[PDB]
Amino acid sequence: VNLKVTIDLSNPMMEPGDLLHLDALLGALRVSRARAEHGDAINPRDYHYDLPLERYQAPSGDWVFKASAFKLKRQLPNQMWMQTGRLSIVEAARHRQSGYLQLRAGKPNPAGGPFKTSIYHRPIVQAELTAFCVGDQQGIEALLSECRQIGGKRGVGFGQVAGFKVEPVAETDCPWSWRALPADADPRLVTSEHARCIAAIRGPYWDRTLHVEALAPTP
């Protein structure tokens, strides 16, 4: 069908450090609905490939979904967001004195331990997201209607989506090659933006055990 999906979100979201792939989001939604259907004790990897999307085939296996990575249109300048974590000394003191906490050390060790305080900073952006993919429409629209957030740090509440739209586009106006592709991919799909790197082309993109040499563009 060669269609395109656009997403607008009211709440600013996390800025991804790597490419965010549409098929990954669809697989996460499929896993969520499978958990809702077949109970909680379910293997995540048995259902995450069952998506209404076509598959490209490299000359030697390495099949990847047609869906491409998300493109960003910035509405506001990027802003740094700071968070930190620490454990309260006073409450632990009271509990240890009351016997509710079994601890024998005299004072927290300055070299490290449970009571060490940490701080970190991450970018935050508010944008318009666009993606191109080839596949059925009704399943895609149902899955997207199931979703409620997008991006990282979803527990804190970032990246609440305002709306989405899916519309068919002409075959010449649906670039899905802006993606992670196998090394032996056809040079017609490969552009000058693609570069050789160790990354994941399929499934969970955060699993380092499945990373392989491939061609990917910078986000």
Binding site: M80, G112, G113, A199
Partner: protein
């Protein structure tokens, strides 16, 4: 080098330690380097100290560390690779600003590893992917994993130089932070807004954090010319052994 730990196999010379174990049965990956441990390989059970806190960066829950990963965990070279670039011909230091300019403007043509430390002593070497192309550099800076394209850096530097022509005192169009933690990071100053077109503003807004962090070191008045880094591989070798 498919996996990072390959450095200790090739860049420097070392062998398996004495007192390790042997693996049998189904293979598992090193919990640090994410490299499979096959039958007959030297490995050690995971016995990290109480000060370890990088559980989020662990690649596997097998609680086994291959001998190359074990050598990577050694303290003596932890402070020897605080700011370094590792290539097949050895290691070099990027602490100096000119070294960073050389790396981010005229990078070496071989696969390498780029590590920069944001503290006195932390584990960085075993959790950074090894790059295979010079157009897309991977740099590990503390808890951050940045992707830097030298051509974009060169374009931004050329634009800054072009806009700074015709003035008596150098002024930075955009404020950048070496620590990369302030709220003003990646924000355009009023002068840059006044003397750059909107296309320049959009280009400066749409760069990944690695480009901003790299530009912060060299996009200043005292412009550093690129200069080759210092070879320190022999000092690391004599310190470790």
């Amino acid at each position: 080098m498919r996996y990072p730990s390959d450095i200790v196999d090739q860049v420097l010379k070392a062998g398996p330690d004495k007192g390790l174990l042997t693996w049998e049965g189904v293979d598992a990956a090193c919990s640090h380097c994410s490299r499979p441990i096959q039958n007959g390989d030297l490995y050690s059970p995971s016995s990290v100290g109480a000060f370890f806190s990088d559980t989020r960066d662990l690649a596997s829950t097998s609680r086994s560390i291959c001998w190359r990963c074990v050598v990577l965990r050694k303290k003596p070279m932890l402070y020897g690779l605080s700011a370094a670039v590792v290539t097949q011909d050895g290691i070099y230091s990027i602490s100096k600003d000119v070294n960073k300019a050389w790396l981010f403007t005229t990078p070496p043509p071989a696969p390498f590893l780029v590590v920069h430390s944001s503290s006195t002593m932390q584990h960085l070497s075993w959790r950074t992917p090894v790059t295979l192309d010079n157009r897309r550099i991977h740099v590990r800076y503390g808890p951050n994993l940045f992707i830097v394209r030298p051509e974009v850096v060169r374009k931004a530097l050329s634009i800054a130089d072009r806009v700074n022509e015709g003035q008596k005192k150098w002024v930075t169009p955009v404020y950048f932070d070496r620590k990369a933690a302030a709220m003003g990071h990646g924000l355009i100053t009023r002068a840059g807004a006044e003397m750059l077109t909107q296309e320049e503003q959009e280009f400066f807004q749409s760069v990944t954090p690695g480009e901003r962090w790299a530009l912060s070191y060299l996009m200043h008045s005292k412009r550093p010319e690129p200069e080759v880094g210092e070879c320190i591989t022999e000092k690391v070798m004599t310190s470790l052994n």
